[PDB]
């Protein structure tokens, strides 16, 4: 045998890829299968000898039911507090790819009550949209605020991936306060956990999400964080094999693996899964492999601005870098017009802000100071919004019409 935590090497007769094997206390997942040799990842910290090994007949599967709702579990789906859900009907945590023929394209807006989102980049039911945040910005507060307003009739699933105690407890205590923890399931992998637990965290959460939404007829909201911690965990497992690394050590199949998670969402005739993956952009570089690949997969993204945050603005959402691909599907003619006037005028306002660095402010075109005024008010009145303030879509429109009026731009009254 061979053992260096959390990895072990052992001989097996006819090794199965992904096979679960049993030791004394802990389990393990076979991640490599040569001829008689096999590499396996321990579920946790194991001190004992790798002597007796019991081989389960299948890969890792979880029993699905509505018992997970209201409970807190680890990355393996196992209950932390207590006390084991109904062990009926086990499902492979990897699941299956959804037939695009059986899909329905999201067309219904889930209003968040957040102006910087609902107007220009609204979230739709069954949509997968991500949050891109530089280190240190209130990414967690934004997601929590969203979950309050869009999941009052929905089940929330939170997959905590390698996040510190400070982070996941913030979610838990907030689901408790808003009484939304009884209608939610939480899966948590600690920062010190085995890499096999971390990568299983989003899979077990989505396997339950698919069950609740497509076998039972429910609308599900799934949140996960941090996807950058997920990639680190996946790279750790990728390294333990002979696998030839891509850039920065990341596995060359990072896109496909991420896609195997982000694509496990959508809208059908029976139910829906709205997924919001969250990630920290390393060095605030959106071209980094994790935010880049994620943007190539998710149906848009909400980008947090390091500049807006320095201006004491919450939520620090960048209106121009952010995007909602399916937004057009759920927007009315009046809604489309407001998003258009908001985006193009704010963008023009930023252009006038750039030339203000050249020719001083107050020494420029008398429409360029109008767009300049517009951009400022948008940041300080439209984008800026309290963590406990909910705005109707009409209210957000009124703010725009107000700002347009103050800036000397054409407004609708």
């Amino acid at each position: 045998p061979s053992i260096k935590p959390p990895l072990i090497a052992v001989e097996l007769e006819n090794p199965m890829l992904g096979e679960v094997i049993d030791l004394e206390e802990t389990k393990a997942i076979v991640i490599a299968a040569y001829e008689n040799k096999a590499l396996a990842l321990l579920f946790d910290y194991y001190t004992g000898e790798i002597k007796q090994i019991n081989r389960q007949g299948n890969t890792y599967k979880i029993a699905v039911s509505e018992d997970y709702i209201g409970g807190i579990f680890n990355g393996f789906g196992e209950p932390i507090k207590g006390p084991k859900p109904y062990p009926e009907d086990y499902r492979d945590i990897n699941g299956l790819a959804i037939n695009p023929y059986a899909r329905k394209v999201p067309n219904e807006i889930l209003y968040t009550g957040i102006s910087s989102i609902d107007v220009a980049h609204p979230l739709l039911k069954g949509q997968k949209i991500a949050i891109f945040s530089p280190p240190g910005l209130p990414m967690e507060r934004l997601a929590l605020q969203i979950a309050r307003n869009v999941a009052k009739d929905k089940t929330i699933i939170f997959a905590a991936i390698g996040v510190p105690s400070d982070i996941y407890k913030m979610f838990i205590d907030e689901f408790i306060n808003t009484k939304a923890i009884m209608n939610s399931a939480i899966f948590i992998s600690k920062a010190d956990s085995s890499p096999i637990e971390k990568i299983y965290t989003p899979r077990v959460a989505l396997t339950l999400a698919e069950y609740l939404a497509f076998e039972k007829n429910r609308d599900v909201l799934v949140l996960m964080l941090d996807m950058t911690n997920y990639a680190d965990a996946l790279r750790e497992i990728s390294t333990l094999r002979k696998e030839i690394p891509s850039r920065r050590g990341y596995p060359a199949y990072l896109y496909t693996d991420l896609a195997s998670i982000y694509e496990r969402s959508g809208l059908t005739s029976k139910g829906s899964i709205t997924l919001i993956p969250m990630l920290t952009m390393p060095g605030n570089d959106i071209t980094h492999v994790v935010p880049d690949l994620t943007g190539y997969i998710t149906e848009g993204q909400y980008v947090l601005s390091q500049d807006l945050h320095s201006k004491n603005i919450y939520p620090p959402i960048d209106l121009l870098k952010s995007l909602s691909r399916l937004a057009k599907n759920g927007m009315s003619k009046k809604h489309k017009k407001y998003a258009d006037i908001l985006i193009k005028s704010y963008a023009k306002g930023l252009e006038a802000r750039d030339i203000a660095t050249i020719v001083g402010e107050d020494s420029l075109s008398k429409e360029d100071k109008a767009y300049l005024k517009f951009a400022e008010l948008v940041e300080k009145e439209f984008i800026k919004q309290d963590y406990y303030e909910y705005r109707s879509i009409e209210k957000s429109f009124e703010i725009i019409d107000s700002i347009l009026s103050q800036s000397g731009l054409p407004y609708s009254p």
Partner: protein, 567 residues
């Protein structure tokens, strides 16, 4: 006696007797795979299904032929996966929304009853690729072309109603079906590669005037995420002047394939009035579907494109996107224990890409008819850096670069085509079409390029000088450029009147902007540009593309009249 000896992702190594490109059934579930290497008694197999849960001792079943595709009636208005398996049938046979592991369904409908009308009589001699008859496929004349293999005299030929397996003719002792199977890794034969002759007319102005390709040409559409690759490709798939449209969903989002399924049946072909779906074929191997089938979908769609081309039809293939294919190749190469080349990709990446784009071209078919296959390839460069291998390799294979700009997408300037970096290498082959039918647009095209170029140069002076601190001999380019950009280059794909731009509308926009241009130029020094801009017009031209065919043509007259110069 075949035995799997290893399972490494999509790669399975097995013991026994195999062939270099033979399809195999892997495991007890008989998963479709393909041998790609033989080292002694071993065979290296790429599995087009999920390899998770495979045991070592499992068997590997041999088959006769290689990876093929059924070429006949039953493809149009349908959606297939990477292996050409019907996704509508999969859904119904399984009653599930998920895609099963190792489902085995026939490609073409086995029960659908077609009406066959022969174009040849008894006693006639037949060649390969000869039209033996036609089948009406929901308004489309599907020409039953016999395999290139088939030659001889017609001993019997039938007429009327038949299914896809029923014999419709007998040539030299052998039965002739309404379809045949062709290896997707094997380019279908033709007589002679013809010269570029006709411009490939999409519905999009920038791709029809600024950087057009010839019918049978090829183009690359690279850009970062959110730049507009999918929408641009879908817009081409919607309005392109083409007999057959093939959209390949290569390793991308599922919803976007569904998006086509919802909107295309609702839309009408401007050239025929018929619903767009009846000329459309969908190949869908989404991002989280088997990665090895991404490659298959590329070759599959290409073979189908050649098939309809061989009927003497014009076919267009949109591949969204080719980078996901490259990722698949990169993955196979890794597991195979191959030494990586530039950016992890195998050293044979360029040649592999060549096996795709070289299939394009306007040719002389075996039956002496004229057909063309136009291939549009989307590229997804990591971080939006075009210097990456895939993009760069592609640019030495295709006829034009339709580059999408991150800066323009940021401005919501769609399509985000970088008019400075983008190019075409086929303008000299298509200008003849325009020189004849629209003699004045050659000048206006050069004029639009010159104006955009001059406006570009002026932007460096502006940022460190001031936009209003310029002369009116300079400010005109900023003025005209904005009109060209917001009025001509931009095109709202999700507007009813703007989504499609016929050449009539496109040329009229050029003519009216040019007519406005020469008016302003001979008004310098006499009337300042500031005063001219106050009289609207430039704003009215910009909004022209949003108006209907009727509202547009009259507003043009209004603008022409509103241009009176003498004031």
């Amino acid at each position: 006696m075949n035995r799997i000896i290893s399972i490494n992702g999509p790669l399975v190594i097995a013991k026994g007797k195999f062939s270099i490109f033979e399809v195999v059934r892997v495991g007890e579930e008989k998963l479709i795979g393909e041998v790609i290497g033989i080292e002694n008694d071993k065979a290296y197999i790429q599995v087009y299904e999920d390899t998770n849960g495979l045991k070592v001792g499992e068997p590997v079943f041999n088959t006769g032929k290689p990876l093929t595709i059924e070429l006949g009636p039953g493809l149009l208005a349908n959606i297939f996966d990477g292996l050409g398996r019907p996704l509508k049938d999969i859904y119904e046979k399984t009653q599930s929304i998920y895609i099963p592991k190792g489902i085995d369904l026939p490609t073409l409908d086995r029960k659908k009853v077609w009406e066959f009308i022969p174009k040849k009589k008894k006693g006639d001699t037949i060649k390969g690729g000869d039209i033996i008859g036609t089948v009406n496929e929901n308004g489309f004349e599907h020409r039953i072309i016999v395999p290139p293999n088939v030659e001889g005299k017609i001993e019997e030929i039938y007429e009327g109603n038949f299914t896809i397996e029923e014999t419709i003719a007998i040539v030299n002792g052998k039965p002739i079906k309404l379809y045949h199977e062709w290896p997707i890794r094997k380019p279908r034969p033709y007589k002679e590669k013809l010269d570029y002759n006709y411009p490939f007319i999409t519905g999009t102005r920038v791709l029809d005037i600024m950087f057009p390709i010839a019918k049978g040409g090829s183009a690359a559409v690279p850009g970062p995420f959110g730049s507009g690759k999918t929408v641009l490709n879908q817009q081409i798939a919607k309005w392109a002047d083409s007999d057959i449209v093939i959209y390949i969903g290569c390793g991308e989002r599922g919803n976007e394939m569904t998006e086509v399924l919802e909107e295309f049946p609702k839309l009408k072909d401007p050239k025929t009035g018929k619903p767009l779906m009846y000329r459309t074929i969908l190949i869908a191997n989404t991002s989280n579907m088997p990665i090895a089938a991404r490659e298959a979908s590329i070759y599959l769609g290409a073979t189908i494109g050649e098939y309809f081309r061989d009927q003497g039809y014009s076919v267009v293939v949109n591949a969204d996107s080719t980078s996901r294919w490259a990722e698949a190749l990169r993955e196979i190469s890794s597991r195979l224990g191959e030494i990586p080349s530039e950016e992890g990709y195998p050293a044979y990446l360029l040649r592999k890409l060549a096996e795709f784009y070289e299939r394009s071209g306007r040719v002389r078919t075996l039956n002496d008819l004229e057909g063309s296959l136009t291939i549009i390839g989307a590229v997804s460069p990591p971080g939006g850096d075009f210097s990456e291998p895939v993009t760069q390799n592609t640019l030495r294979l295709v006829g034009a670069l339709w580059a999408l700009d991150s800066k323009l997408a940021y401005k919501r300037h769609y399509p985000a085509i970088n008019y400075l970096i983008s190019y075409t290498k086929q303008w000299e082959f298509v200008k003849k079409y325009f020189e004849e039918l629209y003699e004045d647009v050659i000048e206006i095209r050069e004029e639009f390029f010159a104006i955009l170029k001059r406006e570009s140069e002026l932007m460096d002076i502006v940022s460190i000088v001031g936009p209003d601190a310029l002369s009116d001999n300079e400010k005109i380019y900023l003025h005209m450029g904005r009109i060209i950009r917001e009025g001509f280059l931009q095109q709202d794909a999700f507007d009813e009147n703007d989504s499609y731009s016929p050449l009539e509308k496109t040329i009229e926009l050029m003519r009216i902007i040019h007519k406005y241009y020469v008016t302003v130029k001979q008004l310098l020094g006499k009337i300042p540009l500031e005063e001219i801009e106050q009289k609207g017009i430039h704003e009215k031209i910009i909004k022209l593309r949003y108006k209907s065919l009727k509202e547009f043509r009259e507003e043009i007259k209004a603008i022409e009249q509103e241009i009176l110069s003498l004031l």
